UniProtKB/Swiss-Prot annotation, chains A, B, C, D:
The entry's keywords: Allergen, Behavior, Cytoplasm, Disulfide bond, Glycoprotein, Pheromone-binding, Secreted, Signal, Transport
Protein name: Major urinary protein
Induction (UniProt): Synthesis of this protein in the hepatic parenchymal cells is induced in vivo by androgens, glucocorticoids, growth hormone, and insulin, and inhibited by estrogens.
Gene Ontology cellular-component terms listed: cytosol; extracellular space; nucleus
Phylogenetic classification of the source organism: Eukaryota, Metazoa, Chordata, Craniata, Vertebrata
Length: 158, 158, 158, 158
C-alpha cells in the first residue's frame, strides 16, 4: 500500500488520475493563506515522460484561475523540479495510491527558502486518521500545528 | 580567483559574458561525440533572475543550429536544473571568472543517468595547464582520460 | 451544435475532455506518416487560462511517448500558437462539441510552411458522414484525398 | 538602410546585439507607466532558430529584475509570438539596423487587446528626428501623443 519516492519503492504510474487538495501546511503561512501562491486546489495529476503534469485551480483576486504545470524528474532520488513562484524541489513523501498522497516541497526565491507539505486525496475529503498522520509528519519537519490548514472547510474553487 | 557554487563562495554575477567550449568529458562517450546532444559549442552565458541563460550552437545533421536554454536555481546548494535531453542537474565546480569555468552535470532520462563535465574558456582556447587540472577532475569523478574530448581542434560551429 | 473559432461563435469551454485522433490530412504527407511529427494520437484537451492544454501520444521509434503541450490564444480571431516542430498557428474550424472537432493548422520551420488538418472525435471512431464532411474541407484547403489518412485503422498507441 | 518584417525585406540577422529602450507608446497608458508590465528596459536581442531572444530589465516594486523571453516566428508574414502578460503578436515595423528598430505589438488577455509600439536604439538615446518619425507612426496607429513616453529621461534600470 504505502510507497515513497524518497524511500525508492514508489510506482508513480499509479498516481495518475484525479486528486483533491485536503490539507496544506507551511511555516511561511502567508503562502498557504488567502491569496497565497501555494494555496492551490489540485484537480488531476498526469504521468508523462520523465515528468508529472498538474492541473489545478487557484483563486487569484476572487477569481478561480485554471492552470497546469509540468514538473521534471531530476537525477537525485525522488526529486522533481517545477518553476512556480521560484524554483521548487519536491518529493513524494507517502502514498497508498488510491486514497492519499503526501508531497514535501522546498521553495527558493531571491535568496530565501521555505518548506511546504500537502495532502491530496482521491476524494473531496479524507479520513480523520489520514489527517493526523499528516499533521505529525508536518511537525516532524518543523512545521507547527498552527500552520497546518485544512482546505476541506473552505472553497476549493469547486 | 577560484570560487565554486558547491563550495558556496561563488559570485555567479561575474560569469556573465562570452564563453567558448574547450573540453567536454563524459563516460557515456556517445553523447559528447559527433551528433551527440551534449557536444555543445557554448557562446554566451547570461545571468538572470534566479537562473542562467545559455546561448550555444549545436551541429544537428551537419547544420549548426542556434539555441538558448534557461537553467533554474534549485533549493540545494549550487544546483541548477535545465530540461535538455532529459532532466539535468549541474553545478559550478571551479572558476577563476575571467579565464575558465568547469561545470559538472548529471543527466536523467528514462531510468538512466550519466555524468558530464565541461571546461569553458573566455578565449577560443586555454592554457595547457588549465586543461590538465580539468583532466584530473574528470578522473576524480570516474571519467577516464579516453572520454575527455578537446573540442578546440574541431569545428565548434564557428 | 456547430461553432467555430474563426466564425467567432465557439464556446471553447465545452472542448474540455477526452478526444481521439480519427483522421489527419496534410499535403506534406511525410509529416502525417509513420514516424511523422504531426502523426499525433490525441487523448485529452484541457481548457486553461488564455490557452489550451493537449495531452497526446506519439510513436517515436516504435515507442509510444506521452506528451503535453500548451497552446496560447493570440490577438487574432480564433488563432492559437504552439511551438512544436516549428511555429504553429491553428484554429478551430468546426465543432459540434460532443462528437467532433476539426482543427486547421499551419506550420513554419526554417523558411518553410505547410497545412495540417485533423478530425478529433470524443469516441474511438466517428460517423462515416463526419469523415466525409472533413474529407471535403481538406479538399477545400488544397489537401488532396491521397493525403487524408484515417488513423482509426492503425495503432493509435492504445 | 530601412527594412521591415511586414514589408518583407528585413534581414533579422542584423538585429543581433545590444539595444536600449528609448520611447514606448500605448493608448492603454497604465501598461507603459510606472509598475506597468510593458514598461520594459531592453538590453540585448539574440537571433536564434526560428525565433528571437530578448534580455531586458523591469522594475518590479522598486527592484530591477533581469528577464529573458523567447519569441517564435509564426506562419503569417513578419509575425512573432511571445507569451507575456497575455498572448502577444508583434512585427518589426521599421529598422535601419545600426541605429533604431520600431516594433509594433498587440496584446490579448482575458477577452481584451491593446496596441504597443516601441523604439529601440543601439545607443542610450537617439536622434530627435528618429523620435519624431516614431511619434508619427504612433499617431498613424491610433496612439495619441499623450501616450508616447520617452524613457531616456527616467531610470532604465541602468
Amino acid at each position: 500500500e504505502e510507497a515513497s519516492s524518497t524511500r525508492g519503492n514508489l510506482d508513480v504510474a499509479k498516481l495518475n488520475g484525479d486528486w483533491f487538495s485536503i490539507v496544506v501546511a507551511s511555516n511561511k503561512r502567508e503562502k498557504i493563506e488567502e491569496n497565497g501562491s501555494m494555496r492551490v486546489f489540485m484537480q488531476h495529476i498526469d504521468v508523462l515522460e520523465n515528468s508529472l503534469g498538474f492541473k489545478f485551480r487557484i483563486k487569484e483576486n476572487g477569481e478561480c484561475r485554471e492552470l497546469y504545470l509540468v514538473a521534471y524528474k531530476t537525477p537525485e532520488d525522488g526529486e522533481y523540479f517545477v518553476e512556480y513562484d521560484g524554483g521548487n524541489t519536491f518529493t513524494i513523501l507517502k502514498t497508498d495510491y488510491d486514497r492519499y498522497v503526501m508531497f514535501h516541497l522546498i521553495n527558493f526565491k531571491n535568496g530565501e527558502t521555505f518548506q511546504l507539505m500537502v495532502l491530496y486525496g482521491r476524494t473531496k475529503d479524507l479520513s480523520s486518521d489520514i489527517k493526523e498522520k499528516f499533521a505529525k509528519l508536518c511537525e516532524a519537519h518543523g512545521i507547527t500545528r498552527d500552520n497546518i490548514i485544512d482546505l476541506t472547510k473552505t472553497d476549493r474553487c469547486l
